[PDB]
Amino acid sequence: DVTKLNFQALIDAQMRHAGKMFDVIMMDPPWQYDSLSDEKIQNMPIQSLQQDGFIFVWAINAKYRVTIKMIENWGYKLVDEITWVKKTVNGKIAKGHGFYLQHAKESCLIGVKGDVDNGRFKKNIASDVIFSERRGQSQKPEEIYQYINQLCPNGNYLEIFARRNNLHDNWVSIGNEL
Structure with a gap:
């Protein structure tokens, strides 16, 4: 809606695919385009979307601490973080007495619940930074989609609120390969 989304169709469609829920969830919430209040995002039924596996949630600095609490409340244990170190910078003036502009970055908090000591999930992989x-x-x-694939090869993943690609505004497409 994005107030309302058909999670139930999502749940049943996937329970039929695999007999179990998602291996990884990645959320890219629209923190305050359209936006969602912090409450609405917390209220989403994540607990019914995954029983075992990882959750990846993107947060800027201002929503970093609330993303921690949110993940903890859904029942995950926070165990990792990935940083998108960007090529852009924050504003046009260097901070303090500095000369160089401050690089932009976003954090992706990573939680785990349930049984993940299988070969299904792989440890000591990739890198904790993406570009x-x-x-x-x-x-x-x-790279974030690569690094999730590496974490659980051949698993099932769900993304919620994926941010758009600017380049494709003004494009319509039909017949996309699925």
Whole structure:
């Protein structure tokens, strides 16, 4: 709605695919385009979307601490963090007595619940930092999708609120390969 989304169709469609819920959830919430209040985001039925696995939630500095609490409340244990270190910078003036502009960054908090000591999930992989392919891109970097794939090869993943790619505004498409 985004107040309302068909999670039930999502739940049943996936329970039929695999007989179990998602391996990884990534959330890219629209913190205050359209926005969602912190409460509405917390209120989402994440607990019914996953029983075992990881949750990845994107937060800027201002929503970092509330994203921790949110993940903890849904029943996860916070165990990792990835930083998108961007090619852009924050504003046009260096902070304090500095000369160079402050780089932009976003944090992705990572929680775990349930049984994840299987070979299904892999430890000691990839890197805890990701990079843009193009300075100023609006879509999240392809490396976060790679690093999730590495974490649970061949698993099932769900993303909620994926940010759009700026480049494709003014494009319509039909017949997309699925």
